């Protein structure tokens, strides 16, 4: 890369430019220790692109049974063949349709299942795990990954990467919907965008704009000609309780009958649309990071940080959990 790094979100987000640069840790840990997310671009240039095509997954694994989620209403489509998901990944009229006759925005639920990623896809496992940025943090045996070094007094993450596959959201009403709703995790994670399917183009730019993307990010589209995959909103762990207080208030306003100690973040049932994000800012002073994850971008999510994901197009992401020393406190089981 020409330069080692830059700053997105108007200076508030570190963006590293070379995913394999051995000096990345120096500037990374400076921002990581403050509870900030970090972005690393260019990972797709390190991978074998033919291994991350939706057509290839359908051909090699199409006969497996899976469950799908209708992102618009959270309904579950049970016990279908995974080729039913992949064959509609980019051709809309091949997609399963809802009772109202429209093609559904679908998320592939838990595939490969559990910890089976490595067993099912050995070559994809090697291709990714050998090219993850900041390897001392992210690799299973990295010197700064405590995942395999902590006693049972800490919540320890399951093994192997996960794959997250979902169609892109389309309409203006979809703008209030999430691919993955707001929640937090007790460990750190890195999430890599390995494929974006770009066949609506007007609503994508509008969604990015209303999502509060910065102008440098928008220039990655119009000048850099990069493919935007998903819109993230990430909030600092220290603001989690204020977010809960907002979502308890809104829930009551909407007639939900919840006990006063209800945890709407763990519930994973909310997506902060433009109205709620503006309200979170005006009434609680909480500001987040609005991140557009492009092809090859690796999003680093700090433990305890609430975060939500909104697919702009159909995406294939792969994520790996790890436990950094900076944030090990978030998986400790005692107060
Ligand atoms: O912590 C997370 C971050 C992003 C995602 C995700 N990435 N693309 N689509 N969904 C996700 C999915 C399930 C569980 N946790 C997740
Ligand atoms: Cl490292
Ligand atoms: Mn998660």
Swiss-Prot record:
Tissue expression pattern: Ubiquitous. Highly expressed in placenta, skeletal muscle, kidney, heart and liver.
Binding-site positions, Fe cation: 183, 185, 307
Domain of life: Eukaryota
JmjC domain mapped to chain residues: 121-335
Cell location: Nucleus
Disease involvement: Diets-Jongmans syndrome: An autosomal dominant disorder characterized by varying degrees of intellectual disability, developmental delay, short stature, and characteristic facial features such as a wide mouth, a pointed chin, long ears and a low columella.
Domain remark from Swiss-Prot or TrEMBL: Leu-Xaa-Xaa-Leu-Leu (LXXLL) motifs are known to mediate the association with nuclear receptors.
Function: Histone demethylase that specifically demethylates 'Lys-9' of histone H3, thereby playing a central role in histone code. Demethylation of Lys residue generates formaldehyde and succinate. May have tumor suppressor activity.
UniProt family annotation: Belongs to the JHDM2 histone demethylase family.
Name of the protein in question: Lysine-specific demethylase 3B
The gene coding this protein: KDM3B
